Every structure is written in C-alpha cells, then in structure tokens.
Design a protein around this ligand. Structure first.
Ligand SMILES: *[C@@H]1O[C@H](CO)[C@@H](O[C@@H]2O[C@H](CO)[C@@H](O[C@@H]3O[C@H](CO[C@H]4O[C@H](CO)[C@@H](O)[C@H](O)[C@@H]4O)[C@@H](O)[C@H](O)[C@@H]3O)[C@H](O)[C@H]2NC(C)=O)[C@H](O)[C@H]1NC(C)=O
Ligand SMILES: *[C@@H]1O[C@H](CO)[C@@H](O[C@@H]2O[C@H](CO)[C@@H](O[C@@H]3O[C@H](CO)[C@@H](O)[C@H](O)[C@@H]3O)[C@H](O)[C@H]2NC(C)=O)[C@H](O)[C@H]1NC(C)=O
Ligand SMILES: *[C@@H]1O[C@H](CO)[C@@H](O[C@@H]2O[C@H](CO)[C@@H](O)[C@H](O)[C@H]2NC(C)=O)[C@H](O)[C@H]1NC(C)=O
Ligand SMILES: *[C@@H]1O[C@H](CO)[C@@H](O[C@@H]2O[C@H](CO)[C@@H](O)[C@H](O)[C@H]2NC(C)=O)[C@H](O)[C@H]1NC(C)=O
Ligand SMILES: *[C@@H]1O[C@H](CO)[C@@H](O[C@@H]2O[C@H](CO)[C@@H](O)[C@H](O)[C@H]2NC(C)=O)[C@H](O)[C@H]1NC(C)=O
Ligand SMILES: *[C@@H]1O[C@H](CO)[C@@H](O[C@@H]2O[C@H](CO)[C@@H](O)[C@H](O)[C@H]2NC(C)=O)[C@H](O)[C@H]1NC(C)=O
Ligand SMILES: *[C@@H]1O[C@H](CO)[C@@H](O[C@@H]2O[C@H](CO)[C@@H](O)[C@H](O)[C@H]2NC(C)=O)[C@H](O)[C@H]1NC(C)=O
Ligand SMILES: *[C@@H]1O[C@H](CO)[C@@H](O[C@@H]2O[C@H](CO)[C@@H](O)[C@H](O)[C@H]2NC(C)=O)[C@H](O)[C@H]1NC(C)=O
Ligand SMILES: *[C@@H]1O[C@H](CO)[C@@H](O[C@@H]2O[C@H](CO)[C@@H](O)[C@H](O)[C@H]2NC(C)=O)[C@H](O)[C@H]1NC(C)=O
Ligand SMILES: *[C@@H]1O[C@H](CO)[C@@H](O[C@@H]2O[C@H](CO)[C@@H](O)[C@H](O)[C@H]2NC(C)=O)[C@H](O)[C@H]1NC(C)=O
Ligand SMILES: *[C@@H]1O[C@H](CO)[C@@H](O)[C@H](O)[C@H]1NC(C)=O
Ligand SMILES: *[C@@H]1O[C@H](CO)[C@@H](O)[C@H](O)[C@H]1NC(C)=O
Ligand SMILES: *[C@@H]1O[C@H](CO)[C@@H](O)[C@H](O)[C@H]1NC(C)=O
Ligand SMILES: *[C@@H]1O[C@H](CO)[C@@H](O)[C@H](O)[C@H]1NC(C)=O
Ligand SMILES: *[C@@H]1O[C@H](CO)[C@@H](O)[C@H](O)[C@H]1NC(C)=O
Ligand SMILES: *[C@@H]1O[C@H](CO)[C@@H](O)[C@H](O)[C@H]1NC(C)=O
Ligand SMILES: *[C@@H]1O[C@H](CO)[C@@H](O)[C@H](O)[C@H]1NC(C)=O
Ligand SMILES: *[C@@H]1O[C@H](CO)[C@@H](O)[C@H](O)[C@H]1NC(C)=O
Ligand SMILES: *[C@@H]1O[C@H](CO)[C@@H](O)[C@H](O)[C@H]1NC(C)=O
Ligand SMILES: *[C@@H]1O[C@H](CO)[C@@H](O)[C@H](O)[C@H]1NC(C)=O
Ligand SMILES: *[C@@H]1O[C@H](CO)[C@@H](O)[C@H](O)[C@H]1NC(C)=O
Ligand SMILES: *[C@@H]1O[C@H](CO)[C@@H](O)[C@H](O)[C@H]1NC(C)=O
Ligand SMILES: *[C@@H]1O[C@H](CO)[C@@H](O)[C@H](O)[C@H]1NC(C)=O
Ligand SMILES: *[C@@H]1O[C@H](CO)[C@@H](O)[C@H](O)[C@H]1NC(C)=O
Ligand SMILES: *[C@@H]1O[C@H](CO)[C@@H](O)[C@H](O)[C@H]1NC(C)=O
Ligand SMILES: *[C@@H]1O[C@H](CO)[C@@H](O)[C@H](O)[C@H]1NC(C)=O
Lengths: 449, 124, 124, 124, 48, 48
C-alpha cells in the first residue's frame, strides 16, 4: 500500500504531431457536372467546434502539409475531368488572316483577326472550308499578307473542354479520418507564426472556395478589426507579402458584345464549336472599381505597413515589371471565359508620412496554359450573349522590389503569380495531430488474486 | 455537464481521468480511393492497441488494475504532486524513455505468471 | 435441432432468445474493387457495436447483466405479457424513441461508477 | 531468454506452451493496390478467430479453462505421453478429423448453458 | 450447396418497380461492356 | 548442378558458379545525337 503499483489508462488526451491523407466532404443539396464533386460523402448539418482551455501550441504556416496536397488535389483532378473530352490535332494548320474595318475608335484597332483554313470532315478524303476569328493573343505569324499559326503548336497538344461541365467554384470541406483531429487558432490578429493562446478542435474545416486568380484574391474569406500583413522573412526581396483586407471592395467586370456561335463536325463523331461573328458594335471588356472605396482601402493598408518599415518613410506604389502575361496582369474566369486585365490605374499614387469609377481595360484569350506547365494546353468554347459577374476583392499580393541602402522608401508592385499563395490565405490556421490514447501512471491499487 | 472530445487536456491529471469515455467513443467514427485509404487506416490503428490491451489482462476495461511494483527509479516523485500539479501532456514527456521497459515487464511477468498459477491452482 | 440463420424471427421473444449463437457466427463470414468495397464495409459495421458492447461492461458475453433500474415510463407493461405475447420485430418498434436515453444512461452511470468504486474499494 | 517468432516449433508440447506471447504479438504487425489487398487480408484473418474465441467464453485469455469432458474416443492416450513425447505439429494431425465436433460441442453445451444458469441463479 | 432457410409466421410487404437490384444490374452491364471493348482494334479509316 | 529430370533433352541445366569471372563490354564510337519535332508537341531523338 505504501509502495505503488502501475495502472493502465485508455483514452487519455495527448496528441503529438504527424501527417496523413485527407478526403473531401461537401454538399448542400440540376447541378450536372463541375470539376468532380458528385457525392464525395455529403456533410453533416451541425459542425462540432469544441473550445479548449489553458492550452497553448506553437503554430507555423509556411511548413504545413495541408497546402502541399491541396495543390496536388487540383491539378490531378483537372486532368482527370478533361481526359475523355474531344481532342483536336487537326487544328494546327497554316492559316491566312486579315485585319478588320477602319474601326477608328483606336482601342480595338487591329485586335480581332478573321481567319480561314482547311479542316477535315467526316469522310477521310474530302475537305471542308471554314471561316472563324481569333483574338490577337492566339496567332503568331511566320516570319504584304502573311500566314499565321496557333500560339501553342510548337509546345503542347491542344484539347477542347467538354461543353457540358462548368468551372464555377463550389465550397469544399476537408475532413481528417477517424483517429485524428485538426486544431484551429481562434484569435483576431494573427501574424502567421507564433503561440496561439486559445485553440479549438474541429474535424472538418469551413467552406473553402477554390478560385483561381492572380494579383487580387477573389471571393475569399474576410478578416477582423484591422488588416494583417503576413510573410516569411521580410527584408528578403524574393518572398511575397500576403495582405488580407478588412472591408470588401466590389468589382463589376463584364463584356458588351453578343458573339454568335456555330458548330461543324471535325469527324467522324467529334463536334467543334468555333467562334462566329459579332453582332452590334465592338468595345473593350472592362471592369469598374468605385474610386471612393478604393482610396479608403489603400489608406488603411498603408497605415499598417508603417509597423514593418519604420514610421518615417514615404510609401510609393507602381506597375508590374514584365514577364509572361499571367504574372504582370490580373487574371480570372467569369462564367466560363478567361479575362486578362491590366490594373495600372490602381497601384499608382505615392504617399507621404504625415462618386467616380476607375476603368480597367481587359483583353481576352481563348487558349489557356494554366498552372505554369508545358505539355498540356486547353481550348475554351465561346458563350452566347453578354457576360456579367459581380465579385468582391478580399486580399492583395504585393512584391517588394530591391535596393541596397535604406535611402527613402522601398517601393511595392503586384505580381507573384505562383499558385500556392492562393491556398495559404485560408489554410493558415489548421494543423493535423494524432491521438495516442494510451498511458501508464502509479497509484495505490492492486489486482485481486 | 461533460465538456466534449479532448475536453480536459488543459486540466490536471486528477480531473481529466474522470471523463475518459468521451475519448473512447469518438475514436472509430476516381477519388473515392483516398476515402478508402482512410477507412482502412482508421481501423488498423484501432486494432493495434485493442490487441495490446488484450494481452495485458485488461480485456475490456478502462481503469484496469495490475500487479508489477513501481521501481521508483522511473519517477522519484510522491503520490500527491503527480495527480494535482501536472497535466497528461507533461507526464507523458517525463516518463518517456522508460516505456519499452514497462510494456515488456507488464505482460511477461503477469499473464505468463497468472495463467501458470491458475493452471497450477485449479488442479484441485 | 436448431433452425438456422434468422430462424426464429416469427417466434415469440421467450423462445427466440435461446438460439442466439446462430445470428452471431454468420455475421462476419477491374471489378474486384466492388468486392473490396464490400469486405471493408463488412468489417467496419462489425467493429462498431463490438466497440459498443466493450464500453457497457459486456465485453464478450451475449446475455449480460446490468444495474440501471427500469424507469417504467419507457414501457408500462408488466414483464410476462412481454416475453410471451410479442415478437422481437414488434418490441423494437414500441421502445423505439427511448433509446438514445438508454444508451447514454447505460454506460455513464455504470462504468463511470463501478471503476470509480473499485479504485476506491481496492485501496485496502 | 526467449527464442523468438515460431521459436519452439521443434520442441516438445510441454515446453512450447510457456512462450505463447511471442506468436500473439507479431500476428497483426498503380502498385499500392497490392499493398492494400494485403492490409485488408491481414486484418480479416485476425478478426475471424478473435470472434471465435469470444463465443467460447475465452474472451481475452490465452490459457482458458473449459468444462466439456474428454470423450476418450478422440484420443486414447494418457496424460504423460502427450505432453512429453509429441510436438504441436504432430498432435494437430492425429486429432484432425474430430474437430468440427469439438468446435460445435465447445460452445453449444457451455455458453448456452452457463448464461442460462446465471440468469436462473442471479434471480435471487 | 446454397442455404435456403424457411421462415414461419412472417409476412413482409413486397414491391417491384421500386427495387434497387434492377438499377445496378443495368449499370453493371453497360459499364462492363465498354471495359471489354476498350483495348480492341479501333478503325477510323473505314469512313471513306 | 540443378534441373528437373535430367535424361530429358528438352529441359535446361541451371549451373551456378563459385568464384566470379569479370567482363568488360564497351563501345568505342562517339555517336552525336540530334532532335527534331515529328509534331505537334512530341519530340524524336534520332541517331546522328
Ligand atoms: C464570386 O462569387 C460570385 C457570387 O458570390 C460569383 O457570381 C456568380 O457568377 C455566375 C456566373 O454567371 C452567376 O451564374 C448565373 O448563370 C446563369 C446562366 O449561366 C449558366 O447557367 C446554367 C448552369 O450552368 C447553364 O445551363 C447555362 O447555359 C449557363 O452556362 C445566368 O442566367 C445568371 O444571370 C448568372 O450569370 C451567378 O449568379 C453569380 N452569383 C450571384 C450571387 O450573382 C462570381 O462568379 C465569383 N467570382 C469568380 C471569379 O468566380
Ligand atoms: C486548302 O486546300 C486547298 C486545296 O486545293 C489549297 O489550295 C492549293 O494551294 C496550293 C498552294 O498554293 C496550290 O499550289 C499552287 O500551284 C500553282 C500552280 O501554278 C503554283 O504556281 C503555286 O506556287 C502553288 O504551288 C494549289 O494549286 C491549290 N489548289 C487549288 C485547287 O487551287 C489551299 O492552299 C489550302 N489552304 C488554304 C489556307 O486555303
Ligand atoms: C514556339 O513559338 C513561339 C512563338 O511566339 C516562340 O516564342 C518566340 O520566340 C522568339 C525566339 O527568337 C522570341 O524572339 C519571341 O519573343 C517569342 N515570342 C514571344 C511572344 O515571346 C517560342 O520560342 C517557340 N518555342 C520554342 C521552344 O522555341
Ligand atoms: C462580398 O460578397 C459576398 C457574397 O458575394 C457578400 O455576402 C453577403 O452579402 C449580403 C448583402 O449585404 C449580406 O446580407 C450577407 O450577410 C453576406 N453574407 C455573409 C455570410 O455575411 C458580402 O456582402 C460582400 N461584401 C463584403 C464581405 O464586404
Ligand atoms: C444578341 O443576339 C441574340 C441572338 O439572336 C438576340 O436574341 C434574339 O435573337 C432572335 C433571332 O436570333 C430575335 O428574333 C430575338 O428578337 C432576339 N431577342 C431579343 C430580346 O431581341 C439578341 O437580341 C442580341 N442582342 C443583345 C443580347 O443585346
Ligand atoms: C457594381 O454593380 C452593382 C450591381 O450590378 C452595383 O450595385 C448597385 O448600384 C446601384 C447604383 O445605381 C444602386 O442603386 C444599387 O442599390 C446597388 N445594388 C444593387 C443590389 O443593385 C454597384 O454600384 C456597381 N459598382 C460600381 C462601382 O458601379
Ligand atoms: C497598362 O496600361 C498602360 C496604359 O498605356 C500601358 O502602357 C504604359 O503606360 C505608361 C503610362 O501611360 C507608359 O509610361 C508606358 O510606356 C506604357 N507602356 C508600357 C509597355 O508600360 C501598360 O503597358 C499596360 N500594362 C500592361 C501590362 O500592358
Ligand atoms: C499615375 O499617377 C500620375 C501622377 O499622379 C498621373 O500623372 C498625372 O495625370 C493627371 C491626370 O489628369 C495629369 O493632370 C497630370 O499632369 C499627370 N502628371 C504627370 C507628372 O504625369 C498618371 O496619369 C497616373 N496614371 C494613370 C494610369 O492614372
Ligand atoms: C562481383 O561484383 C561485385 C560487385 O560488382 C563485387 O563486390 C564487391 O567487390 C569488392 C572489391 O573486391 C569487395 O571488396 C566487396 O567485398 C564485394 N562485395 C561483397 C558484398 O562482397 C565482387 O567482388 C565481384 N566478384 C566476385 C563475387 O567474385
Ligand atoms: C566526342 O564528341 C564530343 C562532343 O563534341 C567531344 O566533346 C567535346 O566537344 C566539344 C565540341 O562539341 C569540344 O569543344 C570539346 O573540346 C570536346 N571535349 C573534349 C574533352 O575534347 C569529345 O571530345 C569527342 N571524343 C571523345 C569522347 O573521345
Ligand atoms: C531569410 O531566411 C532566414 C532564415 O531562413 C531569415 O532568418 C532571414 O530573415 C532571411 N535571410 C536574410 C539573409 O535576411
Ligand atoms: C484619398 O484619401 C485621402 C485621405 O483619405 C485624401 O487625402 C486624398 O485626397 C484622397 N484622394 C486621392 C486621389 O488620393
Ligand atoms: C510610429 O508610430 C507608432 C504608432 O503609430 C509609434 O509607436 C512610434 O513611436 C512611431 N515612430 C517614432 C519614431 O516615433
Ligand atoms: C485553467 O487554469 C486556471 C488557472 O490556471 C484554473 O483555475 C482552471 O480550473 C483551469 N481550467 C480547467 C478547465 O480546469
Ligand atoms: C530498477 O531499474 C534499474 C534499471 O534502470 C535496475 O537496475 C534495478 O534493478 C531496478 N530495480 C528493481 C527493484 O528491479
Ligand atoms: C510530496 O512531496 C512534497 C515535497 O515538498 C511534500 O510536501 C508532500 O508531503 C509529498 N506527498 C506525500 C504524499 O508524501
Ligand atoms: C530518451 O529518449 C530520447 C528519444 O526518445 C533519446 O534520444 C534519449 O537517448 C533517451 N534517454 C536515454 C537516457 O537513453
Ligand atoms: C407460428 O404460429 C403458430 C400459431 O400462430 C404457432 O403455433 C407456432 O408455434 C408458430 N411457429 C413457431 C416456429 O413458433
Ligand atoms: C423517468 O423519465 C422521465 C423522462 O421521460 C424523467 O422525468 C423521470 O425523472 C424518470 N424517472 C426517474 C425515476 O428517473
Ligand atoms: C401483467 O399484466 C397482465 C395484463 O393481463 C396480467 O394479465 C398479468 O397477470 C400481469 N402479470 C404480472 C406478473 O404482473
Ligand atoms: C419517436 O421517433 C420518431 C422517429 O424516430 C419521431 O418522429 C418522433 O417524434 C419520436 N417521438 C417523440 C415523442 O418525440
Ligand atoms: C532438439 O532435439 C534434441 C534431441 O533430439 C533435444 O535434446 C533438444 O532439446 C531439442 N531442441 C530444443 C530447442 O528443445
Ligand atoms: C463419444 O463419441 C462417439 C461418436 O464418435 C459417440 O457415439 C459417443 O456417445 C461419445 N461418448 C459420449 C460419452 O458422449
Ligand atoms: C502413459 O502410458 C504409458 C504406457 O506404456 C505408461 O507407461 C504411463 O504410465 C502412462 N501414463 C499415465 C499417467 O498413466
Ligand atoms: C479425416 O479427414 C480426412 C481429410 O480431412 C478425410 O479424408 C477422412 O475421411 C477423415 N476420416 C474419417 C474417418 O472420416
Ligand atoms: C521426366 O519426367 C518424369 C516425371 O515427370 C521423370 O520421372 C523422368 O525422369 C522424365 N521422363 C522420362 C521418360 O525420362
């Protein structure tokens, strides 16, 4: 009795770090096909959010595992939902083109490039002559009138999206398997790394909208009282800055044309929706952001960057530098079509330490080369009517540029373009733990013989 | 009113040992293949320690009683300043070498003794 | 001579409780993937209630004895006109609300009492 | 010092029955699909006889005691020239018809007797 | 030997036209027909 | 010396050695290589 004997306990709370695989689980309720979410174990009405007490855990983004398999479960699912579609090798034919009208507006002068070419019909030994047109970022001449070829017929094989599926994003929850748990930081101002003094255990994360965007995060999740600046090792010019906003700013991108569509058969058995003629009169495709709100939002961000670069410095914004198109511009998809804006009239107007509308010209590509790869390209079928979509901006991606000495104010300019930063602005407060429910301890006890 | 799953993990060891049934119920409950590599992984981590309790004599209990004496070179401390001034997440770090000796001593000196005692006691 | 699997499901509750071993043995015993989604589905429905008997104190029995009193607001009936004039498929409909209260009361008031009684009885 | 896994399979039956814990621990511990058809096959051969011990009354033991009498038309031999002059790989050949009668007689005449004795003994 | 066990004193309401064994009989033929024809010879140059 | 039913002329003999014997196979040429684009997006390394 005075000496002690051991005692085996089961189900005692300890957790130590690990990593697993995860499965998706998202439904609410006609919705024929998205990039695949058919049943995928439909969710539960009430999520359980249990609050812990007297518990602190060191947290760290930039070293998570939930990022590196979020990004593997998009590009491995994108190719899957495009494998059985129509492929098109016989599009890469040398084709003749001309410019348009006088069109003396001078915004759309030399932009639309009507072309004509040969294309194989159903029967093998007859030919079909077709007329179509393509935006200026899809044809490249071969060095009076000259010939043209599609922009990707030396790098990757073209394939067409199936005309039934839709790329509109739906929410996705991640859930950990039975015998694991996912923690969750629950303060308001969280600068990415550090101790989070009030954690909470759930099993399935909140609704993640997996949009694709550059330089401006769209339809994201908000923040609280003041905006937050997050990075890894600032004072390093090669790492981004993931700004998250407080109040949202609306946006009204649209397109005014009408754009009839036609369809022939390539053959024997695959159709091909090309882009017919434009009825009406042509303008650009543009976007509006209200000037009174956007002035206030940059005023709120630049008060926050003073804490990380000294109080006496006179912050200046600028344009993007250069490179390929998906880095120097703002790009997204609206209903099934891929825009490419400019955003030069936003990141102007330097600062000093002491009703309107801004228009944005946006040109359009049809052949995308997404996720920075080579060896897999994609055609996109056009859409009848006009295109209208409203969204709201929650989040910027700024890139500091260099210098040597602290001589009057480092400048900022957008860009980044890498896809993993899009999924770090909502997986910044989750890590995966493993329950180890055994344990031994001594007490004054003895088994009856 | 009970707190919930992992609810008392900041509490002391004396109070968190009362609500042990909560952490025991919720331990078992072409892209379905990642769902299927999770339902097999969940059931095989559970069968492992359910095997490991079955060989210690603790077949279906939660607070089971054993018979090996505490060597007191594993933890010098008293009775009182363990159950009141430590948490479970901190006790499992201090004893943490000292545990492939216990898991060997807990079954070899007991179920290979008790079952060779009753087979030599129930002869009569 | 025993009847067989599900054999006495039309019989009364007094006679079908004798042959309970028959419904316990036969509970576990590119197109092989539908075979593989069946062998995983069969073993995980069996581990669920095998967990659920292990927490009620009924670790490996079939007719196990418990200690909660019958509230008699769950079924007014009086013991005999239950075991002789009803079948199992009809008793499980009448009690059928009344069952997330029993499964909570059956383990919380017993194994979180008995194991905190013996740890306070075997101190001596 | 214990030998190891399957270590005493040439030894006599009297000596190999002492180290039975070794053969019990190590029983559970596009080309990953052959790995996955092995981890499911390993857990379902283990749940089968773990079911089969649970119905014989031997819920979690290794040397469990039963109550059926030995008919002595199954094996004529004595006590002494079984445990000292035979191995386990040879005893399991001689009794080998004689085993669908034992597995039927071992559970029907015992757990369908004992549980209908205690339900008629604990009435008082 | 298949086991066919006969019940007693038991009636159950039955219904065809609402079964589930029909709707996956028919899925396990057309999804098996295309599988046993995928690696075969294809012929585009016949349509001349 | 290992086989199945020797005195049968259609079955092999699987000799295994005791000490190893080295071997030094090589090729002395230089063999430049080139690459064109059989196309559209598939390269082809032929032998220069
Ligand atoms: C940010 O979130 C916004 C909402 O929170 C998104 O706005 C949504 O944008 C879509 C795109 O148009 C709107 O969808 C409607 O579509 C129908 C017809 O379009 C298709 O409908 C069916 C279903 O696929 C199909 O059979 C048809 O052939 C069409 O292909 C139109 O009639 C509607 O007017 C409207 O365009 C949503 O209504 C709209 N949401 C809201 C609340 O208005 C926005 O797209 C998000 N931003 C990004 C970048 O994803
Ligand atoms: C689409 O298919 C038609 C099929 O006829 C192509 O037309 C052919 O184009 C070639 C190339 O210019 C012509 O050859 C020419 O022959 C004259 C003869 O003097 C020679 O002087 C030229 O230098 C050239 O070799 C060929 O005659 C012509 N076929 C016909 C019936 O006129 C056409 O080029 C294809 N592509 C497009 C974009 O239309
Ligand atoms: C495939 O064709 C494209 C056509 O644009 C090539 O891109 C051009 O390459 C020349 C090489 O002298 C550059 O001067 C141009 O600036 C490039 N165009 C653009 C828009 O930047 C591309 O190089 C070709 N692929 C390969 C592997 O050579
Ligand atoms: C950003 O967009 C979202 C959805 O597109 C807006 O969400 C809802 O907007 C209505 C209109 O005021 C509100 O009544 C709802 O309460 C909003 N939803 C939620 C969950 O709050 C949102 O208003 C937009 N603006 C922001 C966030 O500033
Ligand atoms: C854009 O083109 C569409 C397609 O024609 C027009 O919609 C209808 O077109 C038919 C004939 O094609 C006419 O008989 C209808 O009167 C048109 N509808 C309407 C409401 O006028 C559409 O009008 C065009 N213009 C837009 C959308 O501004
Ligand atoms: C962006 O578009 C939305 C709707 O498409 C505009 O919101 C409406 O603006 C009008 C202005 O006359 C108001 O009367 C409405 O009350 C607003 N709301 C709705 C629900 O219609 C928004 O103003 C546009 N933004 C800009 C900068 O023009
Ligand atoms: C965004 O729009 C501007 C508006 O013209 C484009 O042109 C630059 O404009 C500035 C200021 O007017 C000039 O100093 C530059 O010389 C212009 N050209 C270039 C190449 O910068 C600007 O190019 C557009 N952005 C992109 C990425 O095309
Ligand atoms: C970026 O900012 C500069 C400086 O504010 C703008 O240049 C001025 O534009 C206004 C427009 O009315 C003129 O009145 C000034 O004379 C310009 N000043 C200079 C020094 O050029 C410039 O236009 C802005 N760019 C954009 C695209 O808005
Ligand atoms: C056959 O080749 C193997 C590997 O290519 C040789 O293996 C090693 O050779 C060195 C050189 O003498 C020895 O020091 C090592 O001990 C050898 N490895 C092992 C595992 O013994 C080997 O010598 C060659 N000759 C034979 C087997 O006769
Ligand atoms: C075989 O051909 C290679 C490929 O040229 C020779 O390697 C080098 O070739 C470059 C130009 O192709 C010369 O400038 C170098 O001087 C060459 N290297 C050397 C070490 O001479 C290589 O010399 C050729 N002969 C061999 C391998 O015997
Ligand atoms: C970037 O990285 C190091 C550590 O990874 C960090 O401490 C530092 O701020 C940065 N490096 C330099 C040279 O500033
Ligand atoms: C924007 O707001 C600031 C302060 O809110 C004000 O000083 C300035 O005049 C506004 N307009 C512009 C164009 O900066
Ligand atoms: C800059 O501002 C912050 C708060 O706005 C203040 O604490 C700090 O002292 C200021 N810098 C200097 C050099 O005074
Ligand atoms: C948390 O800590 C405080 C003091 O550190 C203590 O009073 C309280 O009981 C603890 N919480 C729980 C649930 O025990
Ligand atoms: C306690 O453990 C040590 C090994 O660390 C051992 O030498 C000692 O004999 C043990 N004491 C008893 C009483 O077994
Ligand atoms: C535990 O150790 C402390 C040492 O300060 C002492 O106060 C206390 O009496 C000890 N408890 C027991 C039960 O001996
Ligand atoms: C205790 O364990 C750690 C890691 O498990 C090990 O590195 C250390 O050597 C162990 N302590 C001793 C005294 O062996
Ligand atoms: C079936 O019902 C009849 C009367 O309803 C009864 O006599 C008979 O015992 C029942 N069958 C069985 C197997 O109990
Ligand atoms: C019986 O159950 C009811 C709830 O339906 C409850 O109010 C009552 O107190 C229970 N009786 C006893 C003795 O616990
Ligand atoms: C039970 O109630 C029924 C109602 O008929 C009565 O017949 C039966 O005698 C009662 N039995 C007992 C033991 O209370
Ligand atoms: C009994 O259960 C049914 C369905 O399970 C439910 O609809 C009904 O409301 C329950 N009865 C009561 C009194 O709540
Ligand atoms: C092996 O056989 C010999 C004699 O046959 C016996 O003495 C020895 O004990 C056996 N080995 C073991 C491990 O029992
Ligand atoms: C022993 O088994 C035989 C069957 O082989 C049987 O006839 C005999 O009755 C059994 N003996 C006893 C005592 O049950
Ligand atoms: C076992 O049988 C042999 C027969 O020769 C005999 O020597 C021995 O006494 C028997 N053992 C017992 C315990 O009867
Ligand atoms: C014993 O078993 C074997 C095979 O298991 C069988 O062939 C033989 O008939 C059986 N013996 C008897 C007497 O039935
Ligand atoms: C080859 O096969 C038989 C048995 O399979 C073997 O016994 C014999 O050596 C060979 N046959 C002849 C005819 O030699």
């Amino acid at each position: 009795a005075e000496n002690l004997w051991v005692t085996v306990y089961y189900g005692v709370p300890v957790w130590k770090d690990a990593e697993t695989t995860l499965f998706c689980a998202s439904d609410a309720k006609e919705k024929h096909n998205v990039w695949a979410t058919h049943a995928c174990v439909p969710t539960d009405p009430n999520p359980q959010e249990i609050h812990l007490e007297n518990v602190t855990e060191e947290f760290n983004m930039w070293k998570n595992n939930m990022v590196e398999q979020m990004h593997e479960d998009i590009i491995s699912l994108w190719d899957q939902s495009l494998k059985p579609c129509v492929k098109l090798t016989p599009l890469c034919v040398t084709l003749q083109c001309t410019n348009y009208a006088p069109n003396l507006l001078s915004n759309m002068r030399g932009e639309l490039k009507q072309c004509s070419f040969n294309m194989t019909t159903e029967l093998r030994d007859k030919k079909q002559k077709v007329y179509s047109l393509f935006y200026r970022l899809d044809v490249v001449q071969i060095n009076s009138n000259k010939e043209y070829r599609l922009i990707n017929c030396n790098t990757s094989a073209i394939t067409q999206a199936c005309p039934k599926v839709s790329f509109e994003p739906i929410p996705i929850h991640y859930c950990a398997p039975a015998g694991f748990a996912i923690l969750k930081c629950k303060d308001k101002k969280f600068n990415g790394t550090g101790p989070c003094p009030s954690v909470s255990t759930v099993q399935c994360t909140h609704g993640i909208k997996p949009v694709v965007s550059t330089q401006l995060l769209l339809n994201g999740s908000l923040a609280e009282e003041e905006v937050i600046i997050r990075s890894e090792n600032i004072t390093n010019n090669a790492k981004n800055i993931l700004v998250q906003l407080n109040t949202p700013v609306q946006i009204n991108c649209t397109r005014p044309n009408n754009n009839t569509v036609k369809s022939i058969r390539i053959g024997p058995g695959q159709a091909f929706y090309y882009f017919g003629d434009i009825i009406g009169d042509i303008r650009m495709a543009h976007c509006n952001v209200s000037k009174a709100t956007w002035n206030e939002t940059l005023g709120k961000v630049v008060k926050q960057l003073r804490k990380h670069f000294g109080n006496n410095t006179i912050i200046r914004f600028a344009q993007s530098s250069g490179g390929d198109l998906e880095v120097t511009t703002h790009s997204f998809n609206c209903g099934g079509e891929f825009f490419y804006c400019n955003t030069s009239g936003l990141f102007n107007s330097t600062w000093i330490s002491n009703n309107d509308s801004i228009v944005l010209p946006c040109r359009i590509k049809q052949i995308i080369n997404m996720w920075q790869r080579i060896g897999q390209a994609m055609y996109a079928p056009p859409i009848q009517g006009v295109i209208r979509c409203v969204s709201n901006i929650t989040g910027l991606i700024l890139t500091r540029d260099g210098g040597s000495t602290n001589s009057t104010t480092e400048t900022f300019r957008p860009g980044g373009g890498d896809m993993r930063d899009n999924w770090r602005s909502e997986l910044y407060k989750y890590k995966v733990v493993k329950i180890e429910p055994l344990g031994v301890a001594p007490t004054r006890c003895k088994r009856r013989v | 009113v009970s707190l919930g799953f992992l609810g008392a993990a900041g509490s002391t060891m004396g109070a968190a040992s009362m609500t042990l049934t909560v952490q025991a119920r919720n331990l078992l409950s072409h892209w379905g293949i990642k769902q299927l590599q999770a339902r097999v992984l969940a059931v095989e981590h559970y069968l492992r320690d359910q095997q490991l309790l079955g060989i210690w004599g603790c077949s279906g209990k939660l607070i089971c009683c054993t018979n090996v004496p505490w060597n007191s070179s594993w933890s010098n401390r008293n009775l009182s300043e363990i159950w009141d001034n430590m948490t479970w997440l901190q006790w499992d770090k201090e004893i943490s070498n000292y545990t492939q000796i216990i898991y060997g001593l807990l079954e070899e000196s007991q179920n290979q003794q008790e079952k060779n005692e009753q087979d030599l006691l129930a002869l009569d």
